[PDB]
Amino acid sequence: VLTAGLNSQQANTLHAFLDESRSAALSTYYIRQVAKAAAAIKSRDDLY
Amino acid sequence: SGATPYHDAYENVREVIQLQDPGLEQLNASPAIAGLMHQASLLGINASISPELFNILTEEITEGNAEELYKKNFGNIEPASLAMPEYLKRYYNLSDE
Amino acid sequence: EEIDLNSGSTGDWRKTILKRAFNIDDVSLFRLLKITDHDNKDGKIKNN
């Protein structure tokens, strides 16, 4: 309902924002729940 | 996992409200509507608080369920490792300050 | 597929996309339907 009401620049800003937020979440989840323990990953820098 | 009950739909809602009204002025000007919601939830307009987090924040911690909650909030890790300041720092991606 | 354009309808993803495509709300979308079709006795259209 809300994203449909945005103009194009607000939408571009929104999408940029969300991707940054999603990365932090996906990365953290991945590191703790998915990443193989063989890889000593404790951070986003190590995931990189 | 680093406290990450990430809710994308929540963030879409939160960001749009900030994009449409960057200071919530319309709400300041329209108390009939703002007053329909409890302040604890209005907090999430600005604060990054997903409904799962909201329920965690309002969760009662007592002696009887302390072990249970550990398992349900941190997961089955080890309370002794969470206790280590380095572990803690990495777990929540914290600064030293 | 049916899309309910009654201004009083609740949404779904198809309805949201249509609003998004035009950057308009449900009240003005309903009126848009009446501009295009003065015979439709309801707000429902198929996704033709």
CB contact under 8 A, A1 and C23: no
Q: How far apart are CA B36 and CA B4, in angstroms?
A: 29
End-to-end Cα, chain C, rounded Å: 8
CB contact under 8 A, C23 and A7: yes
Tell me the structure's resolution in angstroms, rounded to a single decimal: 3.7
Strand partners, C46: C2
B16-50: string of b/e by CB count within 10 Å (b at 16+)? Answer: bbbbeeeebeebeeeeeeeeeeeeeeeebbeeebb
Q: How far is B77 from chain A (nearest CA, A)?
A: 11
C24: left (phi over 0), alpha (psi -120 to 50) or beta: beta
Unique residue bearing structure tokens 């449909």: A4
Task: Specify the long-range contacts of residues A21-27, CB closer than 8 Å, at least 24 apart.
Answer: A21/B6, A21/B8, A21/B11, A22/B6, A22/B8, A24/B4, A24/B6, A25/B4, A25/B6
CB contact under 8 A, A1 and C20: no
Cβ-Cβ contacts under 8 Å, C20 against chain A: 3-4
Count of CA atoms in the C-beta half-sphere (13 A) of B36: 4
- The H or E element containing residue A3 is none
Cβ-Cβ contacts under 8 Å, A4 against chain C: 16-17, 19-20, 23
Q: How far apart are CA C2 and CA C43, in angstroms?
A: 10
Cβ-Cβ contacts under 8 Å, A18 against chain B: 8, 11-12, 15
